[model samples]
Target: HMCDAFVGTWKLVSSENFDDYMKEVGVGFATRKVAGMAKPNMIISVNGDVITIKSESTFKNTEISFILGQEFDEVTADDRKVKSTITLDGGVLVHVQKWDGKSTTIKRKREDDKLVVECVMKGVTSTRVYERA
Candidate 1:
């Protein structure tokens, strides 16, 4: 089913405007360069009432676990401590994070058997695509 389509590992395929988005998110130039150079692999899993999203990369590997509609504390890859919530609708996962007087929204969905991750921060949007690994 489409809802369970994100239950596997996916390797990064392409990224669009990620740097600019990171800039909007307040990531420094050096960190952005290192992050951009890393080809991250995302692993998603669901068990009972828990959902885990793990992103592995040479620079930083981050794992976040949560439940649908439940809010929790999350320390982002760039080391920002934020309050996050996840919502699932029609096979798409929407993650909203609020921190440091700002907010960021990320959407993950399966399209054409690939994982599409879109990140938005302060009106800047970045797109990253991943293929099954």
Candidate 2:
């Protein structure tokens, strides 16, 4: 479920509910509609202390970076402003992001062929799974 094996680079093969989940984060109506339809090709690279995830779609491309166990102010790819921190809880990666003072923690893990991302946001949490192609 968790290992150093994820400490490499991965290209997003495909995703499910990516946009809808993002929409729950307050994306604009038009952006939500478009983001839902655009299949973003994503790239994720994780090293010991640093991690980066990038997504490229027909309309936009964005990247976010952070070091292990560090807190930093972040702006989402879609331009949501937040303060964030990440750490490893046991072997799983845990992240807490705060936007306008509201904070949410997200836990992510990898199964056989999917990236299982779970999080609680605005009192509603969800798990959006992504399959590798």
Candidate 3:
């Protein structure tokens, strides 16, 4: 499977510029406050042809599940219901979410012993590194 190397449980090792990224995303003060409060371990797994990437959370849940070439409704914070899709681009899993005529592109790929989550909006680019759980 193309997503084989991406399957694992990971914990946040570090975050780069997420504060700026989320702030610029205009999720507002409330949700950003909440999104920062509870950062949980991530679970990346596959079931048959369906791939699941869940930020295993307590306060707010972030669920993204899709086949390689399909889009689904992903509920984000603060009235942020959007469409999300994932595709395999070489060794990276490209995750893109769009709403209100705006969008963000995320890349999930393995680098050394880390899972690098790089997110790109209009201006800011944030990188989150995760290690073995």
Candidate 4:
């Protein structure tokens, strides 16, 4: 499967502009501070059309599951319930979440054997790089 490349455990290597992105997402100051200091581990698994991504950190642990291009209910780490969909774009995995007419986009791509996840909200962007674990 094309998603085979994404089915693996990844550890955060570095992050960029995460604080600004968190602010754009409305994360509170204290929470954003902790999140900024956290280096979460991402575990991804794919089964047929379903894909599950688990984000693990000392501060929080959350899992999201979905099938490509199919909208599903998603409870974000911040505890917001939204409708979400994931779509594959070439070598990238793009996820979109909408709640109360607000939307967020997260893109995951592999480069040089590393996983790069980019989060975008209100034109602010955060890039998190991960290495296979």
lDDT per residue (tens digit) for residues 1-118 in model 3: 7687878888887888887889877878877777666667889899999998888766665777789879899887556788888888888989888988999998988999999999
* Worst window of 10 by summed lDDT in candidate 3: 56-65
List, residue by residue over 1-133, the lDDT tens digit for candidate 2. 2345454444444455555566567778887777666655556676665787676778688777888778887777567788888887776678898887567777877778666777666656656565553
CA shift of 59, model 4, Å: 1.1
Pick the winner on lDDT between candidates 2 and 3. Answer: 3
Candidate 3: count the clashes.
0
How far residue 67's Cα lies from its native spot in candidate 1, in Å, is: 0.4
Better of 2 and 3 by TM-score: 3
Candidate 3 to native Cα RMSD, angstroms:
1.5
Ranking by lDDT: 4, 1, 3, 2
Give the clashing residue pairs of candidate 3, or none.
none
Q: Per-model C-alpha lDDT, please?
A: 0.91, 0.68, 0.83, 0.91
Reference-based TM-score of each model: 0.95, 0.74, 0.91, 0.95
Model 4, span 6-121: residue lDDT tens: 89999999999999998898889998888799889999998888899999998799998888989999888777799999999997999998998889999999998999999999
Which residue ranges in model 1 land beyond 4 Å of their true spot? none
The TM-score of predicted model 4 comes to 0.95
Off by over 4 Å in 2: 1-3, 8-24
- The C-alpha RMSD of each candidate to the native structure, in angstroms, is 1.3, 3.2, 1.5, 1.0
